[PDB]
Every structure is written in structure tokens, then in C-alpha cells.
Design a protein around this ligand. Sequence first.
Ligand SMILES: *[C@@H]1O[C@H](CO[C@@H]2O[C@@H](C)[C@@H](O)[C@@H](O)[C@@H]2O)[C@@H](O[C@@H]2O[C@H](CO)[C@@H](O[C@@H]3O[C@H](CO)[C@@H](O)[C@H](O)[C@@H]3O)[C@H](O)[C@H]2NC(C)=O)[C@H](O)[C@H]1NC(C)=O
Ligand SMILES: *[C@@H]1O[C@H](CO)[C@@H](O[C@@H]2O[C@H](CO)[C@@H](O[C@@H]3O[C@H](CO)[C@@H](O)[C@H](O)[C@@H]3O)[C@H](O)[C@H]2NC(C)=O)[C@H](O)[C@H]1NC(C)=O
Ligand SMILES: *[C@@H]1O[C@H](CO)[C@@H](O)[C@H](O)[C@H]1NC(C)=O
Length: 119
Amino acid sequence: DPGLQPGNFSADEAGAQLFAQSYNSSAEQVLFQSVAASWAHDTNITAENARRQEEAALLSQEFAEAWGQKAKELYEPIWQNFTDPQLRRIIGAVRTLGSANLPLAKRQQYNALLSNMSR
Ligand SMILES: *[C@@H]1O[C@H](CO[C@@H]2O[C@@H](C)[C@@H](O)[C@@H](O)[C@@H]2O)[C@@H](O[C@@H]2O[C@H](CO)[C@@H](O[C@@H]3O[C@H](CO)[C@@H](O)[C@H](O)[C@@H]3O)[C@H](O)[C@H]2NC(C)=O)[C@H](O)[C@H]1NC(C)=O
Ligand SMILES: *[C@@H]1O[C@H](CO)[C@@H](O[C@@H]2O[C@H](CO)[C@@H](O[C@@H]3O[C@H](CO)[C@@H](O)[C@H](O)[C@@H]3O)[C@H](O)[C@H]2NC(C)=O)[C@H](O)[C@H]1NC(C)=O
Ligand SMILES: *[C@@H]1O[C@H](CO)[C@@H](O)[C@H](O)[C@H]1NC(C)=O
């Protein structure tokens, strides 16, 4: 999907600015979809809505993971100097991939551990 997949970009301050500018164009839509599905679940508890809620949650997680991986591979060495506070905060927020840095087996074990503790 073009929306969930970032395009080619440049590893410079101007490239970072274009990265942040393009970040809205997909993040707005993805977050609106996910949070709207969650709101529909929380207002109409019917058994249909939970499937949409979980599908949108997975979609948002994958979008964030892909964008964060691209931002990492493009700006990790140059994550210090930007001469722009707002773009620095944006890049720091996107770069933090979190639990996606684990391999497949370890990521599955981690998600299973969280779910099992909750249960
Ligand atoms: C997450 O939880 C499941 C379910 O078991 C529950 O959690 C355990 C940690 C204990 O507190 C249980 O009392 C509780 O019911 C765990 O699966 C359990 O482990 C065994 C050995 O793995 C399961 O047999 C197989 O295990 C794997 C998947 O784990 C697959 O090959 C099979 O699908 C099959 O489930 C066993 O079925 C299951 N026990 C019960 C009573 O259902 C699971 O291991 C755990 N995951 C992690 C990462 O801790
Ligand atoms: C953050 O990203 C969003 C998405 O690109 C940017 O906001 C968007 O801004 C445009 C106008 O600049 C909005 O268009 C307007 O939308 C509605 C359509 O019903 C209506 O008010 C007008 O007819 C007009 O077309 C647009 O809605 C809006 N958001 C989205 C999600 O499309 C915003 O500029 C970005 N902020 C940054 C980069 O700082
Ligand atoms: C990004 O660059 C790679 C370089 O291999 C290319 O394959 C890919 O098509 C590019 N993506 C876009 C969306 O242009």
C-alpha cells in the first residue's frame, strides 16, 4: 500500500524535513482509521466492531513499524545535529521503534508474554 509504505528520501536536514512533511500525509489517515474503529467499538459494542478495531490496530502498528524502520536506516548515524527543535522531536519520536527491533521468534515470544500476563 502506498499509504503505509514510505518512499525514497534523503539522509539530510532537507530530506528530514520532507520526511516529516510526508509523515502527516499517512499518519493522519492511519491514526484516524484506527481511533475511529476503536470509537465505533466503544459506542456500539456489537460483535462486528471488535474485528475492525483489531484490524485497524494491526494496520497502525505495521505502518508505524515500517516508517520507524525507514527513519532508523536513514537517520540513525546523523541523529544528533538537525538545527531544528520540532524536527528533532519528530525524528526522535519516529526513530523509537520499540519492540520491532526483536527478530521474528523473539517478537512473537514478547507479544505472547504480554498477552499471557494480562490474561
Ligand atoms: C502463553 O500462554 C499459553 C497458555 O498457557 C497459559 O499460560 C502459561 C504460561 C501457563 O500459565 C498456563 O497455565 C496457562 O494456561 C502457553 O501455552 C502453554 O504451554 C504449552 C507449551 O508451550 C502449550 O503447548 C503448546 O505450546 C505451543 C504454544 O505455546 C504450541 O506448540 C501449541 O499450540 C500448544 O499450545 C500448552 O497448550 C499451553 N498450556 C495450556 C494450559 O494451554 C504459552 O506457552 C505461553 N507463552 C509464553 C511465551 O509464555
Ligand atoms: C498534517 O497533515 C495533514 C494531512 O495532510 C494536513 O492537514 C490537511 O490540510 C488540508 C489543507 O491544508 C485540509 O484540506 C481541507 O479538508 C477538508 C475536506 O473536507 C476541508 O476543511 C477543506 O475543503 C480542505 O480540503 C485537510 O483536510 C487536512 N487533513 C487531511 C487529513 O487531509 C496538515 O497540513 C499537516 N500539518 C503539518 C504538515 O504541519
Ligand atoms: C526506494 O528506493 C529503492 C531502491 O532500491 C527502490 O527499489 C524503490 O522503488 C524506491 N521506492 C519508491 C517508493 O520510490
